[PDB]
Amino acid sequence: GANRTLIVTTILEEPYVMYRKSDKPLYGNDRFEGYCLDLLKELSNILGFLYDVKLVPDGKYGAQNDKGEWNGMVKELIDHRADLAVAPLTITYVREKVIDFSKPFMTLGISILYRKGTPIDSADDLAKQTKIEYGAVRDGSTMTFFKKSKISTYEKMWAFMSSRQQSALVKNSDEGIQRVLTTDYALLMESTSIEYVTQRNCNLTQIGGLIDSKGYGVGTPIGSPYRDKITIAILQLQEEGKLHMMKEKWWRGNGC
């Protein structure tokens, strides 16, 4: 019979996955557009499968609590409720214990998003002061980085983030961006998203450099037969320069 339609889990995240602007409500895959949809289109052709896009119910990428329980996109793969995770899913050692990743299709690092025209120049200045609140998206890889850090400054920053019942954390990037714009708040964010936001919000800027270096990969359940095929597909898109064209399509624009 025809090849089974694969279930792709993802999360609304600009410019990776976005609702296509329309008056008439849209249904199925046509609801979405973005870098990851274009990536899913190319992978779909190379491997030869249809796909059905489903958003993660809790809107989280995935972290494990003190009870060892995962949530978010990672948990969807563990429980075999999705065949692939085509999203900016950060490749992390802790995540590699419970799911598989393709080779990375994009590189990034943690950095700080904040308003322009301030004397804040680093995470040290941010952790050393009191006026400015700061945090990260809840139950993402950036939160996990600070939660697990063994570095003194980042340990203090996590203690600050987890205080007052984690009020410094935000539900998602969009909520975090709005918090930066409307309050005295700095968002610990991955550099690829900062590049997108700062070009379209010329009053914001990146503070300091990268405090780590990671990559995004396609997530699959352990033992998935598609992992190696997906990796081969990513490599083909690199030699063809397609991944570069996709980046420019959804990021490149007029600078501030």
Residues that bind Cl ion (CB under 5 A): 96, 100-101, 212-213
Q: Is residue 141 within the footprint of ligand 8VE (CB under 6 A)?
A: yes
The token duo for 130 is 């009191």
Which residue lies nearer to ligand 8VE by CB, 192 or 205?
192
Smallest distance, ligand 8VE to C-beta of residue 50, A: 25
Contact set for ligand 8VE, span 184-213 (CB under 6 A): 189-190, 193
- Tokens of residue 161, six digits: 């983030």
Of 46-105, which residues contact ligand 8VE (CB under 6 A)? 61, 88-90
Measured CA distances, 206 to 118, 125, 154, 195 (Å): 11, 14, 18, 8
43 binds, among ligand 8VE, Cl ion, none (CB under 5 to 8 A by kind): none
Contact between residue 78 and residue 31 where contact means Cβ atoms under 8 Å apart: no
14/125 with CB nearer ligand 8VE: 14
The per-type count for the chain, helices as H runs and strands as E runs, is 10, 12
88 annotated as belonging to a binding site for a ligand: yes
Of the candidates 117, 160, 103, 116, the one whose C-alpha atom is nearest the C-alpha of residue 136 is 160
Binding-site residues for L-glutamate sit at: 88, 90, 95, 141-142, 190
The residues that touch ligand 8VE, with contacts defined as CB under 6 A, are: 61, 88-90, 136-137, 140-142, 173, 189-190, 193
